[PDB]
Amino acid sequence: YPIFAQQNYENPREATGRIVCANCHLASKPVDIEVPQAVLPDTVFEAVVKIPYDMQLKQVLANGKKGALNVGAVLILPEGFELAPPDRISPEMKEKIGNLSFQNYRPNKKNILVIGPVPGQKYSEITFPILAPDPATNKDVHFLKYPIYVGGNRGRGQIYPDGSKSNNTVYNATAGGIISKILRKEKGGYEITIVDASNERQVIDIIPRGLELLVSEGESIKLDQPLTSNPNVGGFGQGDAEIVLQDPLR
Numbered sequence: 663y664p665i666f667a668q669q670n671y672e673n674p675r676e677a678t679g680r681i682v683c684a685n686c687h688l689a690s691k692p693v694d695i696e697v698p699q700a701v702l703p704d705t706v707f708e709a710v711v712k713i714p715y716d717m718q719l720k721q722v723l724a725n726g727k728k729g730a731l732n733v734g735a736v737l738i739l740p741e742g743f744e745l746a747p748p749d750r751i752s753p754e755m756k757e758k759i760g761n762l763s764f765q766n767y768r769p770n771k772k773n774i775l776v777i778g779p780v781p782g783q784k785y786s787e788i789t790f791p792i793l794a795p796d797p798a799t800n801k802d803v804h805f806l807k808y809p810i811y812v813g814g815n816r817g818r819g820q821i822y823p824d825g826s827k828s829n830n831t832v833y834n835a836t837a838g839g840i841i842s843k844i845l846r847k848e849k850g851g852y853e854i855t856i857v858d859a860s861n862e863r864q865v866i867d868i869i870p871r872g873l874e875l876l877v878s879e880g881e882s883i884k885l886d887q888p889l890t891s892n893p894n895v896g897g898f899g900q901g902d903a904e905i906v907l908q909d910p911l912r
């Protein structure tokens with residue numbers, strides 16, 4: 663969720679250039695951003711982010727049932743650029759932004775905006791209303807070409823803030839061996855007993871509901887061998903743009 667990165671990464675872009683959602687949102691899937699080539703001081707412009715996916719896809723929801731995807735994004739602007747105020751947003755633009763609430767990544771970072779989770783059917787392309795700064799009123803903003811970075815995610819992530827896996831990832835055998843028993847559970851899920859004949863050790867790997875097994879009793883499994891399908895139909899991607907803050911003369 664945008665809140666898990668905000669709660670524990672102070673800045674969303676790491677030194678490698680990867681945005682921190684990729685730490686738990688593990689599949690890669692394309693993101694796009696259109697931004698005007700150039701903008702004038704103190705004018706509103708739109709940055710439109712596309713987070714595309716095949717919409718007949720159903721993911722495994724937190725309780726085993728299958729459902730639709732939700733989308734979220736993090737937009738990293740230059741310092742000085744910020745969310746356009748309501749009075750400066752046009753009516754033709756206010757129906758375009760639906761009724762999204764863009765939040766600041768942290769109150770002091772006015773130039774990093776997050777939005778989501780919002781339903782994917784409705785918001786696969788999102789319009790962020792940005793106000794361009796004015797050099798004459800800000801001594802560190804110049805007429806220059808500026809980088810803009812976006813991260814876009816659709817679907818539930820794989821790892822939670824404490825390091826726990828969710829049920830929207832592969833479950834791997836914690837031991838090699840032969841499966842001696844597979845107990846299909848009452849309300850869903852499985853209990854798999856592995857006899858690691860090599861270590862004379864018995865281990866039981868538990869599998870959550872919404873996942874289907876790739877293994878049979880009597881089969882030899884290796885350590886970390888996938889025991890289930892990969893149920894993840896979503897993914898995170900990132901992209902970048904360059905904008906020219908333009909002198910109103912030449």
Ligand code: HEC
Binds near residue numbers: 724734779816821
């Ligand atoms: C790990 C600590 C994570 C970070 C950092 C981010 N996300 Fe995440 N996200 C994570 C999990 C485990 C889940 C699933 C929660 C559940 O049980 O359902 C999510 C979910 C989302 C969603 C909703 C998906 C849906 O309902 O279909 C979105 C839109 C989402 N996350 C976006 C997102 C973005 C853009 C992030 C970077 C700023 C981000 N997440 C970070 C785990 C983690």
